[PDB]
Every structure is written in structure tokens, then in C-alpha cells.
Scaffold this motif. Structure first.
Motif, PDB file in Angstrom:
ATOM      1  N   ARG A   1       0.821  -1.184   0.000  1.00  0.00           N
ATOM      2  CA  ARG A   1       0.000   0.000   0.000  1.00  0.00           C
ATOM      3  C   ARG A   1       0.863   1.244   0.000  1.00  0.00           C
ATOM      4  NH1 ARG A   1      -4.667   3.437   2.402  1.00  0.00           N
ATOM      5  NH2 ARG A   1      -5.847   2.379   0.786  1.00  0.00           N
ATOM      6  N   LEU A   2       2.142   1.128   0.353  1.00  0.00           N
ATOM      7  CA  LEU A   2       3.012   2.289   0.419  1.00  0.00           C
ATOM      8  C   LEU A   2       3.496   2.648  -0.971  1.00  0.00           C
ATOM      9  CD1 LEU A   2       6.538   1.744   0.476  1.00  0.00           C
ATOM     10  CD2 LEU A   2       5.728   0.452   2.364  1.00  0.00           C
ATOM     11  N   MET A   3       2.809   2.151  -1.980  1.00  0.00           N
ATOM     12  CA  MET A   3       2.884   2.717  -3.303  1.00  0.00           C
ATOM     13  C   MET A   3       2.228   4.068  -3.390  1.00  0.00           C
ATOM     14  SD  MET A   3       4.288   1.799  -6.000  1.00  0.00           S
ATOM     15  CE  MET A   3       5.620   1.071  -5.145  1.00  0.00           C
ATOM     16  N   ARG A   4       1.380   4.407  -2.443  1.00  0.00           N
ATOM     17  CA  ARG A   4       0.733   5.696  -2.469  1.00  0.00           C
ATOM     18  C   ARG A   4       1.598   6.750  -1.820  1.00  0.00           C
ATOM     19  NH1 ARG A   4      -4.645   6.032  -0.536  1.00  0.00           N
ATOM     20  NH2 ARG A   4      -4.819   4.024  -1.612  1.00  0.00           N
ATOM     21  N   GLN A   5       2.437   6.358  -0.875  1.00  0.00           N
ATOM     22  CA  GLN A   5       3.503   7.238  -0.429  1.00  0.00           C
ATOM     23  C   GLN A   5       4.525   7.463  -1.523  1.00  0.00           C
ATOM     24  OE1 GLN A   5       2.039   5.244   1.761  1.00  0.00           O
ATOM     25  NE2 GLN A   5       1.453   6.838   3.181  1.00  0.00           N
ATOM     26  N   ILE A   6       4.778   6.453  -2.340  1.00  0.00           N
ATOM     27  CA  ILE A   6       5.730   6.578  -3.431  1.00  0.00           C
ATOM     28  C   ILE A   6       5.146   7.405  -4.566  1.00  0.00           C
ATOM     29  CG2 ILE A   6       6.633   5.178  -5.282  1.00  0.00           C
ATOM     30  CD1 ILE A   6       7.381   3.209  -2.923  1.00  0.00           C
ATOM     31  N   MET A   8       2.835   9.683  -4.107  1.00  0.00           N
ATOM     32  CA  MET A   8       2.780  11.033  -3.572  1.00  0.00           C
ATOM     33  C   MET A   8       4.140  11.697  -3.569  1.00  0.00           C
ATOM     34  SD  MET A   8       0.567  12.539  -0.576  1.00  0.00           S
ATOM     35  CE  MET A   8       0.603  14.295  -0.302  1.00  0.00           C
ATOM     36  N   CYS A   9       5.198  10.975  -3.236  1.00  0.00           N
ATOM     37  CA  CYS A   9       6.509  11.599  -3.252  1.00  0.00           C
ATOM     38  C   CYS A   9       6.969  11.873  -4.662  1.00  0.00           C
ATOM     39  CB  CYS A   9       7.525  10.736  -2.525  1.00  0.00           C
ATOM     40  SG  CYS A   9       7.465  10.867  -0.780  1.00  0.00           S
ATOM     41  N   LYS A  10       6.463  11.120  -5.631  1.00  0.00           N
ATOM     42  CA  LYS A  10       6.778  11.382  -7.029  1.00  0.00           C
ATOM     43  C   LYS A  10       6.066  12.628  -7.529  1.00  0.00           C
ATOM     44  CE  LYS A  10       7.090   9.656 -11.560  1.00  0.00           C
ATOM     45  NZ  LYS A  10       6.176   9.499 -12.730  1.00  0.00           N
ATOM     46  N   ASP A  11       4.813  12.807  -7.127  1.00  0.00           N
ATOM     47  CA  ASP A  11       4.090  14.023  -7.464  1.00  0.00           C
ATOM     48  C   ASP A  11       4.689  15.231  -6.772  1.00  0.00           C
ATOM     49  OD1 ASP A  11       2.447  12.198  -8.677  1.00  0.00           O
ATOM     50  OD2 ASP A  11       1.051  12.168  -6.996  1.00  0.00           O
ATOM     51  N   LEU A  12       5.047  15.083  -5.503  1.00  0.00           N
ATOM     52  CA  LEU A  12       5.712  16.152  -4.785  1.00  0.00           C
ATOM     53  C   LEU A  12       7.019  16.514  -5.443  1.00  0.00           C
ATOM     54  CD1 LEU A  12       5.196  15.084  -1.176  1.00  0.00           C
ATOM     55  CD2 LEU A  12       4.693  17.309  -1.995  1.00  0.00           C
ATOM     56  N   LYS A  13       7.747  15.518  -5.931  1.00  0.00           N
ATOM     57  CA  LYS A  13       9.014  15.771  -6.590  1.00  0.00           C
ATOM     58  C   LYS A  13       8.810  16.489  -7.907  1.00  0.00           C
ATOM     59  CE  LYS A  13      11.581  12.554  -8.396  1.00  0.00           C
ATOM     60  NZ  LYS A  13      12.618  12.006  -9.310  1.00  0.00           N
ATOM     61  N   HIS A  14       7.799  16.098  -8.676  1.00  0.00           N
ATOM     62  CA  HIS A  14       7.526  16.798  -9.925  1.00  0.00           C
ATOM     63  C   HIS A  14       7.197  18.254  -9.667  1.00  0.00           C
ATOM     64  CE1 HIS A  14       8.134  13.283 -12.071  1.00  0.00           C
ATOM     65  NE2 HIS A  14       6.922  13.003 -12.510  1.00  0.00           N
ATOM     66  N   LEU A  15       6.335  18.516  -8.693  1.00  0.00           N
ATOM     67  CA  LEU A  15       5.972  19.890  -8.387  1.00  0.00           C
ATOM     68  C   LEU A  15       7.170  20.688  -7.892  1.00  0.00           C
ATOM     69  CD1 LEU A  15       3.014  21.210  -6.321  1.00  0.00           C
ATOM     70  CD2 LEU A  15       4.010  21.993  -8.416  1.00  0.00           C
ATOM     71  N   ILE A  16       7.920  20.149  -6.933  1.00  0.00           N
ATOM     72  CA  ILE A  16       9.028  20.893  -6.349  1.00  0.00           C
ATOM     73  C   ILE A  16      10.119  21.121  -7.368  1.00  0.00           C
ATOM     74  CG2 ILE A  16      10.777  20.888  -4.576  1.00  0.00           C
ATOM     75  CD1 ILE A  16       9.043  19.351  -2.857  1.00  0.00           C
ATOM     76  N   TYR A  17      10.411  20.132  -8.201  1.00  0.00           N
ATOM     77  CA  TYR A  17      11.455  20.289  -9.197  1.00  0.00           C
ATOM     78  C   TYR A  17      11.048  21.281 -10.258  1.00  0.00           C
ATOM     79  CZ  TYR A  17      14.690  16.679  -7.892  1.00  0.00           C
ATOM     80  OH  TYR A  17      15.663  15.939  -7.293  1.00  0.00           O
ATOM     81  N   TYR A  18       9.781  21.260 -10.659  1.00  0.00           N
ATOM     82  CA  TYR A  18       9.318  22.248 -11.613  1.00  0.00           C
ATOM     83  C   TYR A  18       9.442  23.649 -11.042  1.00  0.00           C
ATOM     84  CZ  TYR A  18       6.472  24.980 -14.619  1.00  0.00           C
ATOM     85  OH  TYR A  18       6.024  25.960 -15.463  1.00  0.00           O
ATOM     86  N   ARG A  19       8.912  23.874  -9.850  1.00  0.00           N
ATOM     87  CA  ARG A  19       8.947  25.213  -9.290  1.00  0.00           C
ATOM     88  C   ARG A  19      10.327  25.620  -8.818  1.00  0.00           C
ATOM     89  NH1 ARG A  19       5.586  28.162  -6.241  1.00  0.00           N
ATOM     90  NH2 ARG A  19       3.567  28.610  -7.223  1.00  0.00           N
ATOM     91  N   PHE A  20      11.253  24.685  -8.727  1.00  0.00           N
ATOM     92  CA  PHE A  20      12.576  24.965  -8.202  1.00  0.00           C
ATOM     93  C   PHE A  20      13.480  25.491  -9.297  1.00  0.00           C
ATOM     94  CE2 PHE A  20      15.356  24.171  -4.632  1.00  0.00           C
ATOM     95  CZ  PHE A  20      16.581  24.110  -5.196  1.00  0.00           C
ATOM     96  N   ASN A  21      13.521  24.788 -10.429  1.00  0.00           N
ATOM     97  CA  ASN A  21      14.466  25.056 -11.502  1.00  0.00           C
ATOM     98  C   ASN A  21      13.992  26.148 -12.442  1.00  0.00           C
ATOM     99  OD1 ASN A  21      15.622  22.609 -10.419  1.00  0.00           O
ATOM    100  ND2 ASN A  21      14.261  21.483 -11.770  1.00  0.00           N
ATOM    101  N   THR A  22      12.937  26.865 -12.092  1.00  0.00           N
ATOM    102  CA  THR A  22      12.469  27.925 -12.965  1.00  0.00           C
ATOM    103  C   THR A  22      13.502  29.046 -13.018  1.00  0.00           C
ATOM    104  OG1 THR A  22      11.074  28.487 -11.059  1.00  0.00           O
ATOM    105  CG2 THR A  22       9.990  27.581 -13.006  1.00  0.00           C
ATOM    106  N   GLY A  23      13.971  29.349 -14.224  1.00  0.00           N
ATOM    107  CA  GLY A  23      15.064  30.277 -14.403  1.00  0.00           C
ATOM    108  C   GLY A  23      16.342  29.571 -14.813  1.00  0.00           C
TER     109      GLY A  23
END
Length: 60
Positions: A1-6, A8-23
Motif C-alpha cells: 500500500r506504500l505505493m501511495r507514499q511513493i 505522492m513523493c513522485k508528485d511532490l518531486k515533480h511539483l518541487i522540481y518544476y517550481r525549483f528550476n524555474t530560471g
RNA sequence: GACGAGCUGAACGCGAAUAUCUCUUUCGCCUUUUACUAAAGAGAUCCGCGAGUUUUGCUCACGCAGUCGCAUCUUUUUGUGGGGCU
């Protein structure tokens, strides 16, 4: 079931990496904004502590 | 007519954070069981949390003290007095 933590951490990573590397910041190691995924795994651990104490007490 | 920080006890109660499990069903993975998916519900648990005096531990602090058993011109506490008739 901890595929949903995985997932979620993948979605969090996509969001953070997108908003991080802007510029000029770009596309590699270097983003260390870890509290979102840290707290995902802390929620996992709080919820699974009782299940695992049960299982490990049964094993013992 | 008047004074707390920290811990364990309180016995009552769920700002914004939420994970897990069980059960009854449906759905999907699909050989089987675990382990799972996503819907409906019904139930638990975890990790925490707020206020009342209980004081344990101050390392703070006190008592002629801040408070006691509206103050003379036409509208208010400076009244219009005095007499006498049934």
C-alpha cells in the motif's frame, strides 16, 4: 500500500522540481527541499507503527 | 474591595495537520492466498493536541499596597418665609 507514499513523493518531486528550476537553475542534483517528502514518510510511519508493533509482537 | 514557569498526574473535550488498520459490499488486478486498485458504507487505531487545582520540582516574587466598614446663580444638596378661614 506504500505505493501511495511513493506516488505522492513522485508528485511532490515533480511539483518541487518544476517550481525549483524555474530560471537559470537547471536540471540535476541540487534541489534539497526535503520537508514535503519527509513528512509523507513520517505520516506513513505514524500510521504503520501500530500495525508493525502488532506484527512484530506476534512474531516475537 | 488583590499575584506562574516546567513534569507527572487531572477528568472532562476534537483552529490544522493524517496515516494505518478491521468489517460489510461492489469494482479492477486475476490461477490461488497474501499483498493491492477504487467506489459505497460501517468501525477502530496511531501520532499529537485545550482549560479548569494536584502538586512534585522555582531557579521568581511580594503587603500604610494599587482599592478600604459628583463639593455655592433660573433644573435639582443651600428649598419662600409669615398668617389664617372649614
Amino acid at each position: 500500500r506504500l505505493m501511495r507514499q511513493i506516488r505522492m513523493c513522485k508528485d511532490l518531486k515533480h511539483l518541487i522540481y518544476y517550481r525549483f528550476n524555474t530560471g537559470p537553475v537547471g536540471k540535476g542534483p541540487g534541489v534539497g527541499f526535503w520537508a514535503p517528502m519527509w513528512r509523507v514518510w513520517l505520516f506513513f510511519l505514524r500510521g504503520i507503527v501500530p500495525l508493525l508493533e502488532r506484527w512484530l509482537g506476534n512474531l516475537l
